[PDB]
Design a protein around this ligand. Sequence first.
Ligand SMILES: *[C@@H]1O[C@H](CO)[C@@H](O[C@@H]2O[C@H](CO)[C@@H](O)[C@H](O)[C@H]2NC(C)=O)[C@H](O)[C@H]1NC(C)=O
Lengths: 199, 64, 49
Amino acid sequence: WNRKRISNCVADYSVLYNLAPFFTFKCYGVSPTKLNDLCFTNVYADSFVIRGDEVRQIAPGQTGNIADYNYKLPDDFTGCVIAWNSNKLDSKVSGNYNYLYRLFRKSNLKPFERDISTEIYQAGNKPCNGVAGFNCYFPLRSYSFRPTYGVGHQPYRVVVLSFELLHAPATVCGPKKSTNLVKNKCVNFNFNGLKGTGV
Amino acid sequence: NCTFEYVSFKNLREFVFKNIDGYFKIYSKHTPIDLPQGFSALEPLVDLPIGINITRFQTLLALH
Amino acid sequence: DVVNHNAQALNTLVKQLSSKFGAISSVLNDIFSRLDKVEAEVQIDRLIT
Ligand SMILES: *[C@@H]1O[C@H](CO)[C@@H](O[C@@H]2O[C@H](CO)[C@@H](O)[C@H](O)[C@H]2NC(C)=O)[C@H](O)[C@H]1NC(C)=O
């Protein structure tokens, strides 16, 4: 997953909750409706295809096949997860085999870690890493996506946004804009999503 | 494969490297002067989410 | 000791606003801005309690 660095721009979050390529949502830490007034320092985005029954493991700190073996989310995840019913682009008749998923691995994963190793893991006592067969099951196993599947088995084009609520210089902000500065007067203020009253 | 790239005695330079949640965090300090006795806190410089598992390190030297 | 008891009681009353009491943040307006009102009043409820 390419960690695309989103910074120094205005993010219109109200765009991304309307249409077919962005239809099913879950959010943690920040309400998605009040995203248009808040700001973040950096937001890191990823895009990927995973079967719909496995999208349930895309959650803060949860376990599973793609969790332990493909990608772990942090358990303090402040962000939103955006999916898409992607039968038309990622599924073909009698299987589409362009996406690969891990079912066994030597190690449990740490959040936001990446491993592109295709070494065949030792399921049993038989030696592996070059050997194929029993006790040397293949690491990269496809789900064979078809448009005739039920809803759980469908390929889902899922986008993950990771927001940073750090009190650093925030370069990503919503569609709202600023006003003039007033000094030495009891006024209401709002600074990059921080609402308060004072002189 | 280069998934990420970035381009920006007398003196003592201090560095601190640590890994939290894949975010590689870098702290730094410079001063002119084994370890001389003193106190100076390091300031955060570069944060970077490579997510690379790191267990060993090695420093680099200069040759003409 | 009377003066120090008064100052210590007032100061200990001051720093317990920093104590989050199981809520997400010490500052109320951050909870109001980050979340909508329904879970926000639960977090403020823990803070006020
Ligand atoms: C990161 O790499 C280290 C180093 O390989 C892993 O730690 C263990 O290192 C010993 C070194 O002798 C190996 O024999 C073990 O097999 C490694 N552990 C596992 C579970 O494989 C460490 O596990 C790696 N981190 C992740 C998240 O995979």
